[model samples]
Target: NSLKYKELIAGELMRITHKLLIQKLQQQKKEVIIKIQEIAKDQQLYDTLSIQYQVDQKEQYYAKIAQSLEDFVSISALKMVSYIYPNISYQVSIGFFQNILDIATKTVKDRGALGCNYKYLKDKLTKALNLQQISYPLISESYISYLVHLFQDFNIIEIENEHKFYYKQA
Candidate 1:
């Protein structure tokens, strides 16, 4: 009887919460459109996008990608370190410091999206770092390759699997 009652109450609460969340999200979306229009007007940029709004959509898209990458790295770091650190021992802290070095090195080697030199991770970071230059967001495959080759020294990932072109952290 108790379990049945609890489940019923829980279901009702979740339904109400979901409805409220949807309404809030719609409001936020409207605000985002207004802000984007303002930014486009200030920059004198124009887009005839019907699927996407005619604002700074491209820049927003790139920024979103870059932000996602940053968020990934942060969450990855936290997940990697949390297991290593304990409630009492400083070994956890030290373990994480070392783990981040490996994480940084591994991130460059990640050839996830395109497979074999997609260079997705590298390009995303480049876009994020070079946000000041609008051209960085408009990067091409050749440009990503050039950046990878040009700045190969900074890359700690090794491309040992030539057929697949998978990267590994050194």
Candidate 2:
């Protein structure tokens, strides 16, 4: 009978400890979310792995192991946010690019009055994105080049000359 009571006490203690651990984990997760948002505002391409390390060390404040991508290409904070908080689903992020497609269609129409120079379109897109409050990671030539590539991927524009581009007709 005494042994049975001891077993029950041990089980109850474990239950309480598990609850405390979960509460602590939730608090840490919230802190990490705030840290990630702060980092995102910098608007620079960061090695995802490096940022993950920053989150794990005592310097930032975790049982949750950090993870990241290894690709050297620029990554927008908007895109990287999904990876940072893997527990949260990023359905909105998936839809964001489609929204950009809609914006690009208008951009092409605006280009009719503007010009077909690749540089012009790139600048216009950058301005439009800024006006919309979207955060992107690259700047200068790399930024423009990335915009051009996205346009090409969407089939919205095609190269017409060495430095010129035009909206492709549907």
Candidate 3:
């Protein structure tokens, strides 16, 4: 009898805690909405999207091949990296980094929207790197997480302490 009473009290406390969390979230939501109203007036703050067009000429060319919408943003991102690095020498650095991003992008493109397993992308990337003889000092295997996080939903998902990874490069 008393044992059941303890379980009942536990449920009661849990339900109350859940309700508390719900309102806690509600307050944060209201706070965010309030900020949105203020931010909405700041039209100058949102100008960055205009440049996606200039990048699109390059994006268009990349996507034009293989009938690729998927590759556009991936190409666009690298081009942005291309734009930012802005030195003839750093162009090679972009290539080294972009090579990894390329691996993730092209692999996913070939996969046909079933999405890719992180393990599977790693296999291909490691093999690709091995062909080039990439070794211990070049980069850590752990760096795959960083490369993949470079985009969202282009092919990326992650949760802490477990793979849950769905993001990518070459």
Candidate 4:
């Protein structure tokens, strides 16, 4: 019947709209972090309510909400491709650190002993990030300038002589 077809079409439309909702929120990462803080505040408020008075099973009530908050944290933390290091609440930034470094090494290899400057590396890394499905945090030259020193392959004087404050392979 036409009614059955319309129902199926409605469901199909809904599935697409549901993903659009997910994708729209994913595009706005800041809200998710903000909401995490909100939930954390709720848990803290509940904790104080439990601790101030020892009557009426407040402990279990506190535990229940706190447990839900922990579950949310655990699931969100596990879902990131951006979680490379520890002790960092900002996982997206941590994740891009590796990405830029990964491109830095490759740029040095491609450009030979001359390596390349922050400009070239940034170009490659930024393009690589854009071409991919997942969004990466935007980059800055100053951060990339600092990141090069962490690599074992850097030599300040050699690259300086070859080029001005260059990133060279050692």
Best-matching candidate per lDDT = 4
lDDT of 2 by residue, 1-170 (tens): 23333223222222222233334455653322222222222222222223334543432321111212111112222223344342421111223334445665676767674446655655665565563321321224443445556567768677565554799999
Relative to the true structure, how large is the alpha-carbon lDDT of every model? 0.33, 0.37, 0.35, 0.40
Prediction 4 TM-score vs. true: 0.34
Error of 4 at 100 (Å): 3.3
lDDT over C-alpha atoms for residue 28 of model 4:
67
TM-score (all chains, Cα) for each model: 0.22, 0.34, 0.32, 0.34
The sequence of per-residue lDDT tens digits that candidate 1 reaches over residues 1-170 is: 23333223222222222233334455653211112212223111122122233324566533332332232234321122112212111011223323423543455556455334545653564444443422223233433443344335555434444554567989
Full candidate order by TM-score, most accurate first = 4, 2, 3, 1
In model 3, what is the error at residue 77, expressed in angstroms?
19
Q: Which candidate model has the greater lDDT, 2 or 4?
A: 4
Error of 1 at 170 (Å): 41
* Alpha-carbon runs more than 4 Å astray in model 1: 1-117, 126-136, 153-155, 164-170
Tell me how far the alpha carbon of residue 20 in candidate 1 is from the true structure, in angstroms, after superposition: 55
Pairs in steric clash, model 1: 85-92
Angstrom error at residue 141, model 3: 4.7
The list of candidate 2 runs beyond 4 A from truth reads 1-92, 131-140, 153-155, 163-170
Candidate 3 structure lDDT? 0.35
Better candidate number, 1 or 4, judged by TM-score: 4
